[PDB]
Amino acid sequence: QWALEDFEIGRPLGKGKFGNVYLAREKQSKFILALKVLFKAQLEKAGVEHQLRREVEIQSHLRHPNILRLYGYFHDATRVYLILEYAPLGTVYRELQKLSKFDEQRTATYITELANALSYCHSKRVIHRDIKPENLLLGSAGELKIADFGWSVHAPSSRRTTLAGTLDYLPPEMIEGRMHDEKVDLWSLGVLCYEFLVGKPPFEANTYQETYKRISRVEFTFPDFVTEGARDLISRLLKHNPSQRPMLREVLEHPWITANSSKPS
Ligand SMILES: Nc1ncnc2c1ncn2[C@@H]1O[C@H](COP(=O)(O)OP(=O)(O)O)[C@@H](O)[C@H]1O
Ligand SMILES: O=C1NC(=O)[C@@H]2C[C@@H](c3ccccc3)CC[C@H]12
Numbered sequence: 001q002w003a004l005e006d007f008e009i010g011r012p013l014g015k016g017k018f019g020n021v022y023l024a025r026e027k028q029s030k031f032i033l034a035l036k037v038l039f040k041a042q043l044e045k046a047g048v049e050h051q052l053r054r055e056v057e058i059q060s061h062l063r064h065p066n067i068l069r070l071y072g073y074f075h076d077a078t079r080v081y082l083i084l085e086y087a088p089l090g091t092v093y094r095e096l097q098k099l100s101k102f103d104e105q106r107t108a109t110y111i112t113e114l115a116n117a118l119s120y121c122h123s124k125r126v127i128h129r130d131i132k133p134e135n136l137l138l139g140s141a142g143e144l145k146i147a148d149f150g151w152s153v154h155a156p157s158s159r160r161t162t163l164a165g166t167l168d169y170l171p172p173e174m175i176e177g178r179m180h181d182e183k184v185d186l187w188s189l190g191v192l193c194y195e196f197l198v199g200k201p202p203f204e205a206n207t208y209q210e211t212y213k214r215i216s217r218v219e220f221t222f223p224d225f226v227t228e229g230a231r232d233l234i235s236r237l238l239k240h241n242p243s244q245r246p247m248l249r250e251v252l253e254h255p256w257i258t259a260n261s262s263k264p265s
C-alpha cells in the first residue's frame with residue numbers, strides 16, 4: 001500500500017535510539033502526520049525486530065484519547081516507516097526543561113490522564129514498561145498522550161532483551177531481571193509524579209551502578225516544598241513489593257489527585 005513517494009517530508013520532530021521522527025504530509029489528502037524512520041541495518045544489528053512488531057501490533061489496536069494512534073507502516077529495503085498521529089505541542093520532557101518544575105494542578109492533571117490511559121491498557125493486560133517524559137506527547141489541547149510502545153508486552157513477563165539506556169524509571173523487579181507484571185507501570189507513575197513536582201527523578205545518580213543501588217534499596221527523600229498529600233501518593237507507588245502498590249482506581253481517587261486535577265476519571 002503506502003510508500004515513501006506518497007509523502008512530503010518536513011522538519012525533524014525528534015530522535016530516538018532507532019527512531020528518527022519527521023513531520024510529513026500525505027500528498028493526496030494533505031493529511032499531516034508523524035513518520036518514524038528506522039534503519040534496517042541497525043534493527044538487524046541490535047536484533048530488535050520482535051519489539052518493532054509488538055509496537056505496531058499493540059499500539060494499532062488501542063483506541064483511547066490519551067494514547068497516541070498508529071495508523072500503519074511500510075518498508076523499502078533500507079528502512080522501516082511507522083505512520084503516527086502527529087502531536088503538535090511536543091513532549092512533556094521539553095515542557096519540563098522549559099519550566100524546571102510543574103505546580104500541583106499541572107502534575108495532578110497529567111497523572112490523571114496517565115492513569116486513565118494505563119487503566120485502559122491494563123484492561124487488555126498490556127504493560128507499557130517505558131513510561132518516561134520523552135515518550136509522553138501533547139495534543140492540540142495540551143492533553144497528555146502515551147507513545148513509544150516499543151517495549152510493551154502482555155503480562156506476566158520476563159525480560160528477553162538488554163536494557164540500553166537509563167535505569168531511572170524501572171522498578172526493582174525489572175532491573176534485577178526477575179519476573180514482572182502490570183505493577184511495573186505503577187512504579188513508573190510514582191517516579192514521574194516525583195519528577196514532575198521536583199524537577200528530577202528520585203533515584204538519579206552519576207553512574208549506572210549507583211542508580212541501580214538507589215532503586216533496589218528504594219532510597220529517595222523529598223524536598224521541603226513537596227506537600228503531605230503528594231508525599232503520601234508517591235510513597236504508596238514506590239513500594240519495593242509490587243503487590244503493595246495501589247490499583248489505578250485508588251490512584252484516580254486519591255484525595256490529593258481529586259483536589260488538584262482539572263480532569264476526571
Ligand atoms: N507523533 C509524534 N509527534 C511529535 N513528536 C514525536 C512523535 N513521535 C515521536 N516524536 C519525537 O521523537 C522522539 C522519538 O520518538 P520515539 O517514538 O520515542 O522513538 P524511540 O523508539 O527511538 O524512543 C520523541 O521523544 C519525540 O521527541
Ligand atoms: O527487515 C525488517 N526488519 C524488521 O525489523 C522489520 C520487521 C517487519 C515488520 C512487520 C510488521 C510490523 C513491523 C515490522 C518488516 C520487515 C522489517
Ligand SMILES: [Mg+2]
Binds near residue numbers: 135
Ligand atoms: Mg522513545
Ligand SMILES: [Mg+2]
Binds near residue numbers: 016018019148150151
Ligand atoms: Mg523504541
